[PDB]
Amino acid sequence: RDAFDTLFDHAPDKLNVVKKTLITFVNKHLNKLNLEVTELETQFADGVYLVLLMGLLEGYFVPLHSFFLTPDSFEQKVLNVSFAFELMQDGGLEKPKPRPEDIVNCDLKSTLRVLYNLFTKYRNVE
């Protein structure tokens, strides 16, 4: 159990604060690649933006041969997410709480936990 379980159970009306903050953070970076997220619920599920965001934040060039830019199956999306989780740990973040499948399945709690951990680590990156 963590603050996100308490958020959904006891303060679900504060979810907009959470999503607005995280959306603003992710777009600050994705905008540099001519990319833009308009909803956290679905737009990270295929793993592509997560991979691209990590490469950007860490200054690693992520080669296209390393992931699936246009995933066409559940398993390609799971592989993208897993690789993004790998890059997170290469950045010095701890192992994420959610399984990669939870992200692919659009579990909002899982998505928020993952983006929040990026936020807290990379909040000062211009």
Binding site: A3, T6, L7, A11, V17, L22
Partner: peptide, 15 residues
């Protein structure tokens, strides 16, 4: 940048 998110999570952790 300041964020009310930080205080929100702190308060939720305290519960």
């Amino acid at each position: 940048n300041l964020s009310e998110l930080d205080r929100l999570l702190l308060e939720l952790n305290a519960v």
